[PDB]
Amino acid sequence: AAFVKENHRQLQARMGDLKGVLDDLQDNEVLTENEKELVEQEKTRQSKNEALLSMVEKKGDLALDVLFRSISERDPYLVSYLRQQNL
Amino acid sequence: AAFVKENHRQLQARMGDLKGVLDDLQDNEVLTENEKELVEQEKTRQSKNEALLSMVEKKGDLALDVLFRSISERDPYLVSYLRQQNL
Amino acid sequence: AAFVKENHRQLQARMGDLKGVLDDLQDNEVLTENEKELVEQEKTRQSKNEALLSMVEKKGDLALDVLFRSISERDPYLVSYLRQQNL
Amino acid sequence: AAFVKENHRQLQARMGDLKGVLDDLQDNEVLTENEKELVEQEKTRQSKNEALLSMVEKKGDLALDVLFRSISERDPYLVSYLRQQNL
Amino acid sequence: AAFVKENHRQLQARMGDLKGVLDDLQDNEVLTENEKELVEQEKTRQSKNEALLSMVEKKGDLALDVLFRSISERDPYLVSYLRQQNL
Amino acid sequence: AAFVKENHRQLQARMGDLKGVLDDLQDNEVLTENEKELVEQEKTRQSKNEALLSMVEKKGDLALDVLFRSISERDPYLVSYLRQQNL
Amino acid sequence: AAFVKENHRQLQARMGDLKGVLDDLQDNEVLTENEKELVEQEKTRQSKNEALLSMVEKKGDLALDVLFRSISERDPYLVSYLRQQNL
Amino acid sequence: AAFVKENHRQLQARMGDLKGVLDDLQDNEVLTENEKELVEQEKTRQSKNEALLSMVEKKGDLALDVLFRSISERDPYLVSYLRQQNL
Amino acid sequence: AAFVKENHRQLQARMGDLKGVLDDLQDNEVLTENEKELVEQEKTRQSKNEALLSMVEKKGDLALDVLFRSISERDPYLVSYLRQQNL
Amino acid sequence: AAFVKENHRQLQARMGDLKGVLDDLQDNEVLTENEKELVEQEKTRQSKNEALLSMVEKKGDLALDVLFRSISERDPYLVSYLRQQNL
Amino acid sequence: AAFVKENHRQLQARMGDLKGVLDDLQDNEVLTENEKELVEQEKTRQSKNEALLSMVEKKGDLALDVLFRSISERDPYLVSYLRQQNL
Amino acid sequence: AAFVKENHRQLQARMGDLKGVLDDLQDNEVLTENEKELVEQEKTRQSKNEALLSMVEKKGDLALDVLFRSISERDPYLVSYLRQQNL
């Protein structure tokens, strides 16, 4: 959870395609259908990432954990990238 | 990695057919199937190269290194060409 | 290399059968198998010559030199012919 | 008419594309052009369905009947589905 | 019907070419022409499968049964595959 | 099944003419006519092998077994060759 | 003009490809380039026909006459078809 | 000017896209950028036309004349249409 | 006309080469050059049959009659075959 | 230039294969590689001619002159044909 | 800069493909990524040109000079065209 | 700070998109979320810039300095533009 909040800007920049991430968060009841649609409405990837992160952080730490695992599985070079840049 | 960013325009122009490169990047889990298809959607080789380079730079340095080695194996006259033109 | 670019149209018209030239460029790793096949797909000799020349120019100066030497050995009246017409 | 009010929530969820239904209601002078446009402005299908149903219910029983026949013709598995779920 | 909902992700992945299935669903009036066109608009097979499944689930149980029988006739190795993986 | 997936690249390279294999898979209802035609559309043998293998893996383990037996009967030096190279 | 308004729904269904009709209406200064592009933006033929008809009716009777003559020249079986169905 | 005031309702209905008209009125300093944006904010074409007409009438007769010439150039069937219907 | 609609699927399967039929339909001004080319674009015979039938049915009964006579002259075993299978 | 604009439709119909003309326009820097590819994307000769003419007219009179001379060299019966039909 | 402002309307009409120009302005730090995306969102070339010109004028004279040089390099017949029409 | 106050009108006209600037001011705790949303409510860019400037000036000199550095990083041609025009 802390890792996600501290890297909010970089995740806003480098998260990438959220379709699979949105699918994961929808399978775990973290997001409703309406919320996912609201995330898909955004025009650019930066706005999509901003909306998704800002909405997930509110719900609690568990949602941040599910988001962290989903992003970790989807792309293994970005968690490692930010983990190395924070060092 | 730096070599790829500095030669972004020239690689955008002269990379050529990515099918083997796309196969390498997919075997190393740098790209998903969805991402590879999104790269293949483009109409021209210039747009394909633009999409591939722009997406690979985002992921991190390791992806740039794998891309550099794969392109180096695929064509030895372009790595030598750019290496000579930078001199 | 410059000689090849300057006579692009005339080489497009008068190069002729590329099978031996394609064999040379393939032995020197200038072309892959896929690229040679793509050159062989073209229907007429003008399109074959156009594809081969346009692809060789992209790779770099070394490829143009290998192509020039291969064409020079394969046919001695075309290098001499163009060399005389440029005068 | 009663069937529409009693199943308002389920119709809000499962009506689907209203373009044909909106065309029917416009041909029968139940809706004006402005009202149809206002229904199409909504962002999601749930909001479109809610707006359309809420606007049709006010007008009267006859409008509800026209809506029921139009929806019945458009999709035959939804009237039968809801008729079975009410049992 | 339950079999389709429980295997939503796997069917989303492995359904394949929908032309014959879409033809069946159009012959059985489960889908209109507009809906079939909207399913064919998608760029990849994963998105086509997602749209088709999500739209079929909405209509009701009968549509889910027709989809199950149509997929069963079209490909006998996928119904058998999922039936074996659920065991 | 594992033998086919692990050697996907080598089978992609050395399988050869698929007409007999496609005939086998068509007689066993693993492939439809449309799928066989789509495999035959490809221009090169590498693309034909890639399409066929990628489509067969999706269907399930039984299809992979039929593919292995068909390739084994068609050419006995390729199953033995790959079995020897994995050692 | 009256024939076009009275057959609005049927023309919405059966007009077909508008490219030639749009070219005619553009040659007669009934539509601008922007308007033709807006008609071409639509996804399906039904939406294209709906937009075109709705835009042509607005401008006046002369535009409806030009549309009737252009459609009459382009396809002679549809004017005869609707003319027969109104009888 | 009088023609515009007397046909306020019909112009409110049939004026259409104002982007070109707004561009003309902006080139002639009849409207500022802020006013044009205020016209573009409206949701429907009827409200846009109402806002534009109501704003132009206040400014004076010359603005109404410029509006008349701009509408005359933009669409030649609507000025002729209203002129014929007023007869 | 009815015979064509009732046997739409079987004609989709067994019509075969349309070149002569397309020639007839072009001689009778039922199809334009563009439409014939659009039918010829399809990759398989099933898709060609689908495009041709779907386009001919739209135009009207006369086009279906011309299609019936042309196919009847081209092949006398398919009209007889379907006429026998409907019995 | 005027000859080209006035006969836009006839050139749109009868120009034919543009490969040589495209080569000329590419040699004179009237078209880039991207523009030539965009012209080559079209499916039919009518669409290719429409794209080429519409793009060349935009650039200016000089481009129209180069196009007229190139078409004049490629085919001497079409310039003479249109020159005779305008008389 | 003055040349760009004075020819604002004609440049809005005749600028053409902006991909290369956008590449220039992005390489020279005149535009951010968000701004380039906002320029690419527009539907037509007229709206793209309107957004691009209106945004470039705001930044200052230096941006206008860079834009003028980029447009000059991209197309040499349009700067000459406007230069000749202004005379 | 003085540079910001003296160019308040010009910054009101030419600041542009504040999303990045708002992000900076929010990262530096100059603005809360509520204030950023209140700035985003405004209808035009002129009103957004007016609200942002008017709110930042009140808070103090440090906020004006952070605003100057953020605008300097966001756009390097506007700080140079105003600095040159004040000369």
Author numbering:
A (entry chain G), B (entry chain K), C (entry chain D), D (entry chain H), E (entry chain J), F (entry chain L), ...: 451 to 537
Quote the paper.
Many NLR proteins nucleate the “inflammasome”—a large macromolecular complex that triggers inflammatory cell death and cytokine secretion in response to microbial or danger-associated ligands. Like many other supramolecular assemblies in the human innate immune system, the inflammasome complex relies on homotypic and heterotypic interactions between the death domains (DDs) to initiate, amplify, and propagate pyroptotic signaling. Inflammasome sensor NLRs can be grouped into two categories based on their DDs: PYRIN domain (PYD) and caspase activation and recruitment domain (CARD), both domains were found to form filamentous complexes to initiate the inflammasome formation. Extending this analysis, we also found that specific type II interface motifs directly dictate the compatibility of heterotypic pairwise CARD-CARD interactions among NLRP1, CARD8, NLRC4, ASC, and CASP1.
To test this, we solved the structures of recombinant NLRP1-CARD and CARD8-CARD filaments using cryo-EM, both at 3.7 Å with Gold standard FSC = 0.143, without masking. Similar to NLRP1-CARD, recombinant CARD8-CARD also formed ~8 nm-wide filaments, but these filaments are more rigid and adopt a single conformation. NLRP1-CARD and CARD8-CARD filaments display similar helical parameters (5.36 Å and −100.8 degree for NLRP1, and 5.409 Å and −99.16 degree for CARD8), suggesting a similar mode of assembly from the respective monomers. Despite near-identical helical parameters, NLRP1-CARD and CARD8-CARD filaments have remarkably different surface charge distributions, that are not suggested by their monomer structures alone. By contrast, in CARD8-CARD filaments, the positively charged patches on the monomer are mostly buried inside the filamentous oligomer, exposing a predominantly negative surface. In contrast, the CARD8 Type IIb surface is partially negatively charged (Tyr531, Tyr527, and Asp525), whereas the Type IIa surface is positive (Lys508, Lys509, and Leu512). Hence, CARD8-CARD is structurally compatible with CASP1-CARD but not ASC-CARD. In agreement with the structural predictions, CARD8-CARD, but not NLRP1-CARD, preferentially stimulated CASP1-CARD oligomerization, as demonstrated by the appearance of slower migrating bands on native gels (lanes 2 and 3 vs. 4 and 5), whereas the reverse was true for ASC-CARD oligomerization (lanes 2 and 3 vs. lanes 4 and 5). We further corroborated that CARD8 is the first human inflammasome sensor that is unable to engage ASC as an amplifier. In contrast, CARD8-dependent pyroptosis was not abrogated in ASC (PYCARD) KO keratinocytes (blue bars).
